Design a protein around this ligand. Structure first.
Ligand SMILES: [Zn+2]
Ligand SMILES: [Zn+2]
Ligand SMILES: [Zn+2]
Lengths: 291, 343, 245, 49, 84, 97, 210, 343
RNA sequence: AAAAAAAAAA
């Protein structure tokens, strides 16, 4: 998705809500942003508009060139091959200059990984673990939909270059900006994925309870019974609560859950029942002044 | 039982009335150590940045012409007086004073009719910061070598600072010492509301569960008893600090539960505690929903239908609504026979 | 969509407006004060009249040209054929007997010219539509219909009695009472537009050549104007701040 | 329903409907002849009726 | 702070807010078996008797009008003049 | 309807009853037919005093006052407001003198 | 282009100063109020670069009608940012000419130390200040600004006796108001505002300078 | 609004529009380029070669001392024509915005394209200055790029920075026309030109050469407050409210609007209808706590011992007393001597 | 009997 900001420090933003297919460790939002021109600095006037990247689990702002060097591309021609597909285009070569000028100090992969790891939450010590932590950001958090295995840095660099290419296309006006209320960019969670998410949560709770029971009965040197290990009330009670109440999550943590997902079926006319069975709800709350 | 009644059949131990007659009477809890009142916290630092941290005197002396001009300008407006005094005391970082600090002249005879000068202790006032209810002090310029540059300030230290402020400095500070002394903003004796404020919720026969304020006061009593047991046994300093932290948390979340930066008071049923501020503040609160907008007794409400045969100063009323609604007509000799046949 | 989004901030604006002005009340001295007694207006709406009993009036002396003003408002006694067609012989006998008459009609014309200049100063864009109590055209029509006024027959109303009745009516139509300089000045500042409308409509030309009002019709009109100007005054104790909100 | 005669007199002398005809908001009546009453007023006061 | 009768500066005309409470208080008084100052022609609702003896200005009520400087003027019923 | 409840005389009703200038209808709908109450208040301290109505005794604990006790009619919601503020370490002293 | 524009703005500022002095009740002749641009160019010159006129040449000394020994100086300093040195020079001129009232037409602004000098020097000599951009427009000639009349203590006392008012119950006007700075109102005075009304013709209100 | 010949002629009104509208270097030029020019008299651009030797034939500075880097700015002719600008004004603006640091050379008037050449002179007296460390040491082409962005995105050629688009038009109704009184005494409306500007700066518009200082106003209430005064704020708020209500054709009586306009302007400044203008008044505590921020207002009144004098309507509503308002603004006394013959 | 949520009417 590509959006434009009327107010703020960003001229344009590029957003992806990337998630691994039918898996846990939920959806991570990756941003590739352009810095706005309206920065009152003498030295930044020669710089101009600049491209940064906002990473999951990192509260700081990282330039994209350090990220590209952290994926194993020390040269600049290879990265500009990854972003600018046609070398004959003048204006995109003019737009890629300030990121290259800013990230001139970092020129090696481990230096880029140390740059990444120094800005994460709860930073490590003595560089290399941070570098290891940087790999944990660059393999499990950056774009899980393209791959979380090893040796997937090439495809991830291709997709990151495609995102920067789209951001530069939308900066120069060669493509239209994306629309939030365009319904092609929307999906409908029916009973299937929603009950699948509930079963993920309840199965994780069941595995945790079974693990605690067998860890209690394994430290005494004795064996255990599998039928006594599984507490069968967990899945049944969780599904019954989240279908009867409508609060879509844990019973103790229902404040963070969506309400009104499950509703009492309206039996007044046949048309009322058919309209209730074919209802689509928008997740926007009913207090928005925006039309 | 000394605070009031409990059910519809009992009597008050104090005033010997029923639930309608008894207004309910207050109790008190003597805290072992003083704790901050949370809603006065934004007031309290406003006095803490105007008086000295050591000698408890004002940063600018009250015989200043600017203070006299502020007092002359703000007669009857103590809040604006506090605002102007806080603006005057915002730039003061040293407790400057001393009657012998103006000896710049040579061969000057001392004056027996001289007014007293500023009685400053010559200490640097720390910057006071806060991340919730914890209050810290930092000295950018160092005092004498026995003072650490960064300290945590307990409520007992603030209580001892605000106790030694004279009544004149309170009066220039916009707080009348007859009713509103500053050292009374730190909770040492907690009032206990009567049973009318916290009703015992009865469900089926007997009162099973109380409301949230009774459970919160139970937490208050348990934390206070734990603190006085731990200081009576002479335990370690971290145990005492943890007890003060829990007692301050319980007092503040009895008073205020919606302040950011502070952990929420976790009620049993997955909800936050509804404190006194949540009772008062709001559209459905005690002011807007119960005082400006209380429900009436003699009223009716139904669907309307047109009637062109009625004149504009008439309304058609159904017979059931007319039988339910009554009017208390006085009995006069003019209508005595008609009211007799009515009864 | 437009009906839903708005309704919340409209109600919030109404609540804010009604809470800012909930205790603003016309007091018993005619002044308008809030709960703390702080003075807001010396008279309610700058004229001390309630909003229910006022109407849209046409001020006739603003938009006219100079020659039209002199043609339609300057009373010329020298046209004796018009004086025989308009007035009876008793009125012509009465006006010729008194010596005050010519200078009194000239004083009327001077007051009309000064009122025209003040009205043109107050309204610079030439608005001949004011909001004033006591609709004079409808009351003149009412006293024409009640007393069966014949507009093609000579009348018995001398213009000096018209001047005396208008002056007595404007002296009895007060808003700010008292005899001090401040009280008198506030009285004419409150009743300036009403006095200009009275003099511009109850002129000695319109009530004699156009309306042809009789004597008792004229005192009935004067008494009704005075009574209904009294009735249009704002009641002390009326909550005008909440009404305004 | 008012429950006292002073409140009853206040309803009579202030709150009653014919006293509330004229808005103080815009010095105009708030109540007018509406719907088929107005339509038949227009249809009755024609010349040919 | 009793203002003298010659020094009263308030209006001499009873407005609707005085009229409503005078009629209500007088109706409550007649309903609580006070003597009726005027004759009767068969009226039973005491608010009608209250208007009937308000027409002849025979109601014993002193209205204490409060000026904004916390001074008060006392006006009798017959000193005021009815308008409607 | 199911709990046999009265109608909500809300804020806007109070607004336009202020606009009508009817003080007695406001006092009726907001004090007389909603929640009247009588409290006994110490004259010196202005707080709620002990009142035993059987033997007709009055006593203020905070002032040791037995005689100078007045009686104030007020809405019950105002009494809960004052007692909740007394739990807020606030003294809303109703100076009845 | 600098000389003609500077002469024009100096003529406009001088005209506004003389209209301000006439509105305060000071003795100002009719030809000073009706002074044209060509009359200013003949009287003072037209080349402000070569000191024709100089900024110190345009000093205006004016006197009051009722009391001829109550006078105003109007100074036109050439420095854009005014320090304590020029303020002290003007103050020494005020002692050696025995005049308690002066207005300094600054160009850019003043240092806050000079503002504190004006504050604590005030209850012997009144030393007001004005920006040059504020004096290019006569504020009272705008159609949104009604007639303001300063009242004496006798008229204020008569007002408070007639309307039974205390001084805190009146409406207020700030001392930093452009109209109050135009009329030189100190704290405690009462200004009478006469405005045109669309329901009563005209309306007189009163405000207290605070 | 305009006066004199600007009011009736479109050319002088367009001159006023050019003097008011913000025209930077963005709105006027065609393109920018940075060249390396080793020989200024033998420059790489042949089209410049016809006139650059004209400028260096009698130069004001040594051509050896200048830096070889060149900034070539080609200007659009139609934007120069629309803004009525000329190249000597641009050169003068450059020379007063950058001083003697830059050399500016402009093209001829009747050329095909309008070319500007900007160079930097190497100040050799400033090259030996000490105290230079960790200051992001400067190359000349980067300095030319940064000053190019500086004079491109920030340099004002004419107008006011706070004013955006400016429209020039003739009104068609009798509201924005000038209404005068003729010799016959009638009212004549004259259709003079006027301007509508987005963005307001009244000190920099009223003080212009040919702008009416009387009829010119704004829709910004705060700017009316720092420009004119509080009574002009009252009149301006009444005018904006009238325009807002007259856009939809709704009519409200003048008294209900003038009352609000006098309520806001009563205290001498702008008293907004928010929690920042109502709760900052001198009213009672129960009146202020009934609107917004109930607990904060109540505890501020507790800490300051504020006395509520029971004069508002909501205060007596809370007390349940008859409120001193409406028909409760007086007291009824029983006349003892009027109790004549009854029954 | 309380609290929360959902569906609605004007
Ligand atoms: Zn009891
Ligand atoms: Zn000290
Ligand atoms: Zn007591």
């Amino acid at each position: 998705y590509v959006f434009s900001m009327k107010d703020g420090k960003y001229a344009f933003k590029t957003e992806i809500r990337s998630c691994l297919e039918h898996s846990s460790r939920p959806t991570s939002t990756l941003w590739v942003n352009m810095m706005a021109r309206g920065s009152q600095n003498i030295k930044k006037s020669a710089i101009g508009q600049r491209i940064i990247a906002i990473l999951p689990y990192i509260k700081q702002e990282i330039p994209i060139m350090i990220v590209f060097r952290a994926l194993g591309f020390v040269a600049d021609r290879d990265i500009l091959e990854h972003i600018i597909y046609d070398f004959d285009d003048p204006e995109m070569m003019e737009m890629v200059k300030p990121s290259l000028d800013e990230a001139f100090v970092v020129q090696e992969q481990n230096v880029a990984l140390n740059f990444i790891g120094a800005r994460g939450a709860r930073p490590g010590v003595t560089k290399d673990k941070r570098i290891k932590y940087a790999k944990e950001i660059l393999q499990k958090e950056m774009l899980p939909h393209v791959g979380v295995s090893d040796f997937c840095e090439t495809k991830k660099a291709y997709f990151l270059g495609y995102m920067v290419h789209r951001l530069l296309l939308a900066s120069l006006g060669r493509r239209e900006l994306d629309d939030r209320d365009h319904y092609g960019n929307k999906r409908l969670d029916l009973a299937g994925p929603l009950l699948a998410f509930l079963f993920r949560g309840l199965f994780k709770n069941l595995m945790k309870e079974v693990r605690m029971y067998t860890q209690k009965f394994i430290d005494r040197g004795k064996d255990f019974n599998l039928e006594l290990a599984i507490k069968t009330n967990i899945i049944t009670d969780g599904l019954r609560y989240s279908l009867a109440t409508g609060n879509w999550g844990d019973q103790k943590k229902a404040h963070q859950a969506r309400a009104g997902v499950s509703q009492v079926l309206n039996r007044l006319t046949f048309a009322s029942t058919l309209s209730h069975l074919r209802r689509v709800n928008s997740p926007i709350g009913r207090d928005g002044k925006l039309a | 039982p000394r605070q009031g009644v409990i059910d519809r059949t009992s009597r008050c131990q104090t005033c010997a009335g029923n639930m309608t007659e008894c207004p309910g009477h207050f109790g008190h809890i003597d805290l072992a150590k003083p704790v901050f009142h949370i809603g006065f916290i934004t007031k309290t630092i406003k006095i803490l940045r105007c008086v000295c941290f050591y000698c408890s005197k004002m940063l600018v002396s009250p015989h200043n012409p600017k203070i006299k001009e502020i007092v002359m300008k703000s007669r009857g407006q103590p809040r604006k007086r506090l605002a102007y005094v806080y603006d005057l005391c915002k730039g003061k970082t040293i407790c400057e004073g001393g009657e012998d600090m103006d000896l710049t002249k040579e061969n000057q005879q001392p004056d027996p009719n001289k007014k007293p000068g500023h009685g400053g202790c010559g200490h640097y006032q720390p910057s006071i910061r806060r991340t919730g209810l914890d209050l810290t002090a930092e000295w950018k310029h160092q005092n004498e070598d026995s003072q650490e540059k960064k300290i945590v300030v307990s409520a007992e230290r603030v209580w001892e600072i605000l106790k030694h402020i004279t009544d004149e400095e309170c009066f220039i500070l916009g707080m009348d010492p007859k009713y509103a002394r500053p050292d009374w903003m730190i909770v040492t004796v907690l009032p206990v509301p009567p049973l009318a404020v916290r009703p015992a919720v009865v469900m089926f026969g007997a009162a099973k569960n109380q409301d949230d304020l009774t459970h919160k006061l139970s937490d208050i009593i348990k934390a206070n008893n734990e603190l006085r047991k731990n200081e009576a046994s002479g335990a370690a300093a971290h145990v005492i600090q943890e007890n003060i932290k829990m007692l301050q948390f319980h007092v503040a979340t009895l008073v205020d539960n919606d302040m950011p930066g502070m952990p929420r008071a976790m009620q049993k049923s997955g909800k936050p505690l509804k404190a006194i501020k949540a009772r008062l503040k709001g559209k459905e609160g005690r002011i807007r929903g119960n005082l400006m907008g209380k429900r009436v007794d003699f009223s009716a409400r139904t669907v309307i239908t047109p009637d062109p045969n009625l004149r504009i100063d008439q309304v058609g009323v159904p017979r059931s609504i007319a039988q339910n609604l009554t009017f208390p007509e006085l009995v006069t000799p003019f209508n005595i026979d008609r009211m007799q046949e009515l009864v | 969509i437009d009906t839903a989004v708005k309704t919340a901030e409209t109600g919030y604006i109404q609540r804010r407006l009604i809470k800012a002005m909930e205790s603003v009340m016309v007091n018993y001295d005619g002044t308008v004060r809030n709960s703390v007694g702080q003075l807001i207006q010396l008279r309610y709406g700058e004229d001390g009249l309630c909003g229910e009993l006022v109407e849209f009036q046409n001020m006739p002396t603003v938009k006219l040209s100079n020659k039209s003003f002199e043609k339609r408002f300057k009373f010329d006694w020298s046209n004796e054929r018009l004086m025989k067609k308009v007035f009876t012989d008793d009125v012509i006998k009465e006006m010729t007997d008194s010596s005050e008459a010519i200078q009194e009609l000239e004083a009327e014309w001077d007051r009309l010219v000064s009122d025209r200049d003040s009205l043109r100063q107050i309204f610079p864009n030439g608005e001949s539509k004011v909001v004033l109590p006591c609709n004079l055209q409808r009351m003149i029509w009412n006293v024409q219909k009640i007393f069966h006024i014949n507009k093609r027959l000579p009348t018995d109303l001398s213009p000096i009695r018209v001047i005396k009745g208008v002056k007595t009516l404007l002296e009895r139509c007060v808003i700010v009472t008292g005899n001090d300089r401040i009280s008198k000045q506030a009285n004419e500042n409150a009743t300036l537009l009403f006095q200009c409308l009275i003099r511009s409509t109850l002129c000695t030309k319109y009530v004699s050549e156009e309306f042809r009002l009789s004597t008792e019709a004229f005192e009935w009109l004067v008494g009704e104007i005075e009574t209904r100007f009294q009735q249009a005054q704002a009641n002390p104790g009326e909550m005008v701040g909440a009404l305004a909100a | 329903v008012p429950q006292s005669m002073e409140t009853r007199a206040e309803v009579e002398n202030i709150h009653i409907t014919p006293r509330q005809i004229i808005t103080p908001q815009a010095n105009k009546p708030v109540m007018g002849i509406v719907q088929d009453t107005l339509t038949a007023v227009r249809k009755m006061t024609k010349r040919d009726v | 702070g009793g203002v003298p009768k010659s020094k009263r500066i308030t209006t001499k005309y009873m407005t609707k807010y005085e009229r409503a409470r005078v009629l209500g208080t007088r109706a409550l008084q007649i309903a609580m078996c006070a003597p009726i100052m005027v004759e009767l022609d068969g009226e039973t609702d005491p608010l009608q008797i209250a208007m009937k003896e308000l027409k002849q200005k025979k109601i014993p009520i002193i209205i204490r009008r409060y000026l904004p400087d916390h001074s008060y003027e006392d006006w009798s019923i017959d000193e005021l003049i009815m308008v409607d | 309807r199911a709990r046999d409840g009265g109608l909500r005389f809300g804020e806007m009703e109070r607004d336009c009853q202020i606009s009508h200038g009817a003080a007695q209808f406001l006092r009726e709908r907001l004090f007389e037919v909603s929640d009247p109450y009588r409290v006994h208040i110490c004259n010196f301290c202005g707080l709620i005093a002990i009142a035993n109505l059987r033997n007709n005794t009055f006593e203020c604990k905070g002032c040791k006052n037995k005689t100078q006790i007045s009686q104030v009619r007020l809405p019950y919601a105002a009494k809960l407001l004052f007692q909740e503020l007394m739990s807020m370490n606030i003294a809303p002293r109703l100076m009845v003198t | 282009m600098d000389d003609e524009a500077e002469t024009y703005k100096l003529w406009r500022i001088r005209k506004t100063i003389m209209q301000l002095s006439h509105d305060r009740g000071y003795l100002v002749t009719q030809d000073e109020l009706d002074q044209t641009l060509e009359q200013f160019k003949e009287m003072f010159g037209d080349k402000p670069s070569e000191k024709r006129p100089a900024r110190s040449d345009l000093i205006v000394l004016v006197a009051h009608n009722d009391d001829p020994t109550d006078q105003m100086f109007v100074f036109f300093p050439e420095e854009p940012k005014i320090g304590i040195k020029t303020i002290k020079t003007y103050c020494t001129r005020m002692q050696e000419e025995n005049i308690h009232r002066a207005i300094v037409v600054v160009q850019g602004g003043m240092t806050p130390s000079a503002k504190q000098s004006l504050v604590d020097m005030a209850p012997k000599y009144i030393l007001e200040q004005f920006l040059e951009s504020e004096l290019l427009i006569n504020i009272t000639e705008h159609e949104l600004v009604p007639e303001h009349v300063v009242m004496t203590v006798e008229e204020k006392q008569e007002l408070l006796s007639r309307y039974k008012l205390k001084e805190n119950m009146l409406m207020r006007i700030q001392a930093g108001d452009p109209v109050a700075r135009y009329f030189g109102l100190k704290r405690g005075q009462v200004v009478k505002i006469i405005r045109s009304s669309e329901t009563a013709g005209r309306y007189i209100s009163y405000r207290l300078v605070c | 609004f305009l006066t004199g010949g600007a009011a009736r002629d479109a050319e002088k009104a367009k001159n006023v529009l050019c003097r008011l509208e913000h025209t930077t270097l963005r709105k006027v030029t065609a393109n920018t380029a940075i060249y390396y020019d080793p020989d200024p008299q033998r420059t790489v651009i042949s089209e410049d070669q016809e006139f650059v030797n004209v400028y260096y034939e009698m130069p004001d500075f040594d051509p050896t001392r200048i830096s070889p880097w060149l900034l070539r700015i080609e200007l659009d002719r139609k934007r120069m024509t629309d803004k009525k600008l000329t190249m000597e004004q641009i050169a003068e603006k450059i020379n007063v915005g950058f001083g003697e640091d830059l050399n500016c050379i402009f093209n001829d008037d009747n050329a095909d394209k309008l070319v500007l050449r900007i160079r930097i002179m190497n100040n050799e007296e400033n090259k030996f200055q000490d105290e230079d460390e960790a200051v992001d040491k400067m190359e000349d082409d980067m300095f030319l790029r940064c000053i190019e962005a500086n004079m491109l995105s920030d340099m004002t050629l004419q107008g006011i920075e706070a004013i955006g688009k400016v429209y020039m038009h003739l009104p068609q109704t009798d509201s924005k026309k000038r209404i005068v009184i003729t010799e016959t005494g009638e009212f004549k409306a004259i259709g003079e030109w006027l301007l509508e500007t987005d963005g307001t700066s009244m000190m920099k518009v009223l003080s212009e050469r040919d702008v009416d200082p009387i009829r010119t106003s704004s829709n910004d209430i705060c700017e009316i407050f720092q420009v004119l005064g509080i009574e002009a704020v009252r009149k301006s708020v009444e005018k904006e409210m009238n325009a807002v209500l007259q856009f939809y054709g709704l009519y409200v009586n003048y008294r209900h609007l003038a009352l609000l306009c006098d309520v806001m302007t009563a205290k001498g400044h702008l008293m907004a209808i928010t929690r920042h203008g109502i709760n900052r008044q001198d009213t009672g505590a129960l009146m202020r706590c009934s609107f917004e921020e109930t607990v904060d207002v109540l505890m501020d009144a507790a800490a300051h011992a504020e006395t509520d004098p029971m004069r508002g309507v909501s205060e007596n509503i809370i007390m349940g007393q008859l409120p001193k308002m409406g028909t409760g603004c007086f007291d009824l006394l029983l006349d003892a001597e009027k109790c004549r013959f009854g029954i």
